[PDB]
Amino acid sequence: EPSDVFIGLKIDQITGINQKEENFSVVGSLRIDWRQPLLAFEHAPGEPKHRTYTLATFLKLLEEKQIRWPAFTYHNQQGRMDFQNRLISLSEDGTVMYLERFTSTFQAPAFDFRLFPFDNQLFFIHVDSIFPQHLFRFQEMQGFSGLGDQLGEEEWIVTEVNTHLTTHNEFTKGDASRFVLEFHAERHLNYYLMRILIPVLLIITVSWFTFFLQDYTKRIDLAGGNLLLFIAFNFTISSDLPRLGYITLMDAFLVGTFIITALVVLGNVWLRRLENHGKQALARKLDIYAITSYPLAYLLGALTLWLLFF
Amino acid sequence: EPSDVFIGLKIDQITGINQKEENFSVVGSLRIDWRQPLLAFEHAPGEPKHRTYTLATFLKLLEEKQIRWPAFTYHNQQGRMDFQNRLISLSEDGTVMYLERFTSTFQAPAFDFRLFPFDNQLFFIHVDSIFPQHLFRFQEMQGFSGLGDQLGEEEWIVTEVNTHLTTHNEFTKGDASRFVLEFHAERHLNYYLMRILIPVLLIITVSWFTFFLQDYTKRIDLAGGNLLLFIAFNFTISSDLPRLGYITLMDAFLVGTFIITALVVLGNVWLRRLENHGKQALARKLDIYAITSYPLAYLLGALTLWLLFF
Amino acid sequence: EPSDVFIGLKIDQITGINQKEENFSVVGSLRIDWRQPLLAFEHAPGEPKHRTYTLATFLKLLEEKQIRWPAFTYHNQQGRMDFQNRLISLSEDGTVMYLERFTSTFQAPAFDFRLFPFDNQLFFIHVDSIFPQHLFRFQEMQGFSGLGDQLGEEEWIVTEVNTHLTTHNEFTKGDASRFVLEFHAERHLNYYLMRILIPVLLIITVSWFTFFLQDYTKRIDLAGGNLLLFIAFNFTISSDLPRLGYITLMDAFLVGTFIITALVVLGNVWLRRLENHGKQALARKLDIYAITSYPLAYLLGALTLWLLFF
Amino acid sequence: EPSDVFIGLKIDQITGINQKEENFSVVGSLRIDWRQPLLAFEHAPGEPKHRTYTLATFLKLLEEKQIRWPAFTYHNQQGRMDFQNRLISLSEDGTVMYLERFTSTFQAPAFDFRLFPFDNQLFFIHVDSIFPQHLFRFQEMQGFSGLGDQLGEEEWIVTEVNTHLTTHNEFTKGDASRFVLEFHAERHLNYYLMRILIPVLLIITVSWFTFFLQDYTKRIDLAGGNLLLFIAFNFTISSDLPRLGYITLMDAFLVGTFIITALVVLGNVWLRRLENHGKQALARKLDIYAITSYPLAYLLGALTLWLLFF
Amino acid sequence: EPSDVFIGLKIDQITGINQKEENFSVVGSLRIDWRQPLLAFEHAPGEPKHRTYTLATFLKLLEEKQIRWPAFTYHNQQGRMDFQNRLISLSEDGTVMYLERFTSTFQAPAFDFRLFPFDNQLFFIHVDSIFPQHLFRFQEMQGFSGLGDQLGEEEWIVTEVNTHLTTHNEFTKGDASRFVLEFHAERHLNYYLMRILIPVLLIITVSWFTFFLQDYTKRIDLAGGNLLLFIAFNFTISSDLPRLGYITLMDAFLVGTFIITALVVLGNVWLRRLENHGKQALARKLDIYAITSYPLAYLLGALTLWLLFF
């Protein structure tokens, strides 16, 4: 018959979310409660009712007693898991109480950047039993699992936390137990507002002010340099994300600014060609369309993306 | 009844404060004095009264004698704690004297950048007992805890150090002992003065000198390029800090320079529009307002932030 | 006679492909099935039919029993192999079932950048037996080897996976067993399209718009600065790749833009030299060739590379 | 009575000096000679007169024999000390010969950047006895301590090496032994000459050549851009050093170039204001002062810093 | 008498050459054959003639039998040596066969950048015996030592590999054995050709095209900005190398472009001063010298360095 293994996972800290590598790092405590009647013991008066063991000697005790422990893996773990504590408390009954304090990076494969920077992401930790459900069954250790209240993350804000149990078939034919700690997080837009939206909007607004100088050459030089600035912002954005196979809301926003700036160069080349061919009066009359086109083009663009993505 | 565990923590070095990741790194010595009568021993004349042990064999001795050690965790630790020394001296009485020399990063979750770079921050190390207060009670080891006199930090300056004891309920239902080493540090502003204030002030002051050329086009070109430089400083500042969800004193300062520069472009476009419409005499008379507005706008802005933040 | 060693390798995650260092990193599970009759055991009723061991004690058991284990090496491994699990299950029969869960970087020496960014690459993991084929023979553990379906890689897309067995002669005179897990991957061009092709095409197209202004000096200034932008893109590309001893498709593409831009400066210098020598009418007539040359030169260049590389 | 512990430290390599973090890294060999009569042994003919032990088993032998070893700490060490060799050779007499080969970073708290880049710095390694002087006394192991002849450091040049013994009171009430290996190193100025002095001098000299064009507007544009270049060099310099609370010779040098460039903008604004107000003859006569002021200002500045710092 | 220790070292991979830190990283296999008659053993018929050991238990066996192993050090090693395999096979005779598979960085102190990028460098691995030549003598294990055929290095090309034996006196009075694996490597110039020579040559050639416009002011502006580009290339080059105390061929090349560009500014200032003083005809006649000087100056410079360095 199978023995119930009580799994509990609590994230104390978010040491960082690295969206370029699609992983996240936490400081966490894993807690297990497992009753093995074979490990039960008798004690003399004065002698303790609870035996405390370093994992090393407790595993060495299990091998001796020919007992199989609920060997588990953090399925989505990455690199080195640095351990703080690996302590066992064994009661007279045979109840094993295990605590595992660690720092570790975990794969974040649920990353969907299509709406970046207005995106919401799913982050999880998968705890799998190496042995199948006929031997060990994972149960939810109540009153422990979740996320702490001093996570240390400033950009991300955790919207909800969940725990559930499911099956996996990684090393076995038959179903094997899997404990899941899941959390959803959305982004604080302040960085994007201050470093990307406000600057891009300023460059566009103060560039439009110069249309009132009525110097077509000067607009051409301005739109040309503006195009270079947007290409530079395009590199600034791309450095935050992985080399995705798909278009971002931000990517569509930058391609939009490229198109409008390209047309600004084209139109003002045409108005200055009119001036060069002794048609200054005509270019000046058409200039009202060029001056009111600019704000309408960027405002039409903003409504196009907002529709295309929402 | 509970046994008194004497905790002492001394920070020898500050290997660095990383404000982008909100953590700090220290070289420290942890000192514990714990009397366990069960560990007492007899000795013959001439034979030593003090037994020296490597943690490995001392823990192996505790497991043998069925003794529970005051298992502790550095609650706010991050990653790998690289150890230099883990040495035990056991007296005939049963007094365990433990020394733990390490290099380690700790979470700095008390980071408040709202007044950056004129900010004061709290840094701490939390030492928690895994076992509750009915088993072990942490006491303050006197004459040891604090911060050394060659910390190696150049930007930060420690204002005060404190040690105290409190309860925690991390793994238990009932209260458990927690030792706290806290320190407050303020920043040396010289870097910000030399690399950010002086340059930004120079760009503004030498740009104002060119107002005396009375060339409105030249002011427009200068304010436009100045706006680009401020956007670049905006990125230089943002790279020092995390992607905060809130506004910095520095952020307000940069947004301010954007607004004033935006208006400088707008005003000088208007003066040059006057010159283009055969109203050069009028633009020249108004120019006194444009020339005296510039210094007043930046000086009014500086007094607005200084009021809004203090 | 030689004993069959059943090798199985499964890649769960691609933590990254680093093309500058020509290596890749995976999270993988190694599975071995090996029957050693010498390890067989008798059991009493109630006592388990399968003994579970930590690698440490199982190797200690092999040394005791004077048994030689199929010692292996990951031939193309690099640096530290961080291990998650190293577990042995020994059946009454003497069937050793070994599981090795790890994170590791592996050399990618098959890297051919000649067609970058339209390149397809071979990535493999080599598992070698230290002892020759007279002692141990590697066999393919069926229904396990391959690559998972949540690899976490965004730029690369795996086209096919293969497993095969071959000989090696690394430490021995005679042939020794080698297990091979191979995979082919092609690149998602979206990053190159969005950050390199679209910008380079825009700079070229909007620069051509200005030819309609008929200002030869302005074209010279524009082509000069365009040349600097392409040199900057040249550095942006070179930072992604190693310092190769051969020419890339991308390198040929950039050298092409340098040549065309060089000639644009040369031609427009000539047209402006005509204007300076009172031959404005002649320069204006020739200008049709200069205006239609530009698009044809870049379109002729694109067909030249596309032929020279395909 | 106290036993003499012979300490010897030899630095084979300087893996790097990181002045931003104020630390340095070495590959070194620690050598200890300690006679413990209790460890003495008898040997049979043919049996060795010197017993060789891995530190692990030698410490295990000391615990058994109830002997206290001279437990030491590298006081100024930082992070992980990677070990190559930890070997003990025990003679029939009881003379312990210990060798410790390691790679490690050490705190450099003696860093004085006030004269950078013409600075000389003190680097040391502190080896402390955990037990006081009544138990163990450190002595200087003769003919071993120092620095090798293939250190691998290219920027720094070691001027002298010293060894001495002093007391410390880190974990004890009474004085405890401390071994010191100290070295002084000065900087090779070639990098600063080639990448900072020559460029800054060229920008200044070739900018002065343009004064002979007698175009005041052109000088204003040149000095404005020069000011931006110096702000960029200011960032290039600041990236090499920590965020110091004090002024560098280099910082004074850059602030100087800012002031002179600021005045160049101011003066040439004035000369062009004269030209604009029909006083070109006056501006042209005063221009001799503006042309000879420039070289004298930078040469007067250089003599001011050279006095203020030496 | 001394026992022959057969050393063999094979480099499988070059994980990288870091010329800024003057070190290199390899994946290598160390092989030792050492006959110790004391380790010989008896076996019954059917029982194995070869005993296979994990280094841990084999060293524990040597300590037990009171045998001294040929303790060695990788003299030029740096940081952590990550081990893949540490396996011993002991024959009935007492022949120890040891295999050490590792990833490690080694100091490269033979680095001579004086002719960079046309430089050839020496790279080596030093394997030293801790015990002197009276105890152990290193011999060359034949048919193993060298470098593999899938090194994975793209920039460097290995010209030759050598193995030899020499003495060292690191920890002893008398000579001690040292095994040497040496290799020479030259650089693939393609990176330098594509990213540094072609761009610098283009900037120079297309800048010369504009001399045919006969606008002295425009040449001054072009040479001024060219000087800034060369200062930027000067930083791009310096970032690849350590902060050397000597001049590079590349450094001489950049200082040369600074001088020629400085003179271009000077000459064209003079020609424009002639035009300003109503001597346009004279400046136009002298212009032939200025136009033909430019190509001759750079071609004379290139022949000067090529002579000064070869």
Ligand SMILES: CCCCCCCCCO[C@@H]1O[C@H](CO)[C@@H](O)[C@H](O)[C@H]1O
């Ligand atoms: C930059 C946006 C500011 C808009 C107001 C117009 C004033 C001029 C701004 O400077 C100019 O900006 C161009 C575009 O970035 C560059 O091509 C050019 O070299 C630079 O002189």
Ligand SMILES: CCCCCCCCCO[C@@H]1O[C@H](CO)[C@@H](O)[C@H](O)[C@H]1O
């Ligand atoms: C910029 C701070 C220095 C002010 C002194 C005035 C002289 C000219 C300095 O160069 C200016 O640089 C800006 C930024 O690139 C350009 O927008 C602008 O057109 C250009 O004239």
Ligand SMILES: CCCCCCCCCO[C@@H]1O[C@H](CO)[C@@H](O)[C@H](O)[C@H]1O
């Ligand atoms: C950037 C190409 C955009 C084409 C639109 C034409 C308007 C001018 C764009 O600014 C150009 O930017 C270069 C940056 O290097 C300068 O060298 C060049 O003198 C300047 O005129």
Ligand SMILES: CCCCCCCCCO[C@@H]1O[C@H](CO)[C@@H](O)[C@H](O)[C@H]1O
């Ligand atoms: C620039 C140092 C070399 C001086 C030699 C005189 C020729 C002109 C150099 O081009 C300068 O480039 C700056 C870029 O920042 C601009 O701001 C400035 O207006 C422009 O004149």
Ligand SMILES: CCCCCCCCCO[C@@H]1O[C@H](CO)[C@@H](O)[C@H](O)[C@H]1O
């Ligand atoms: C860049 C080399 C190309 C040579 C052909 C001349 C076309 C103009 C290229 O733009 C130039 O950029 C320089 C660097 O910023 C400025 O100094 C210069 O005054 C400006 O005109």
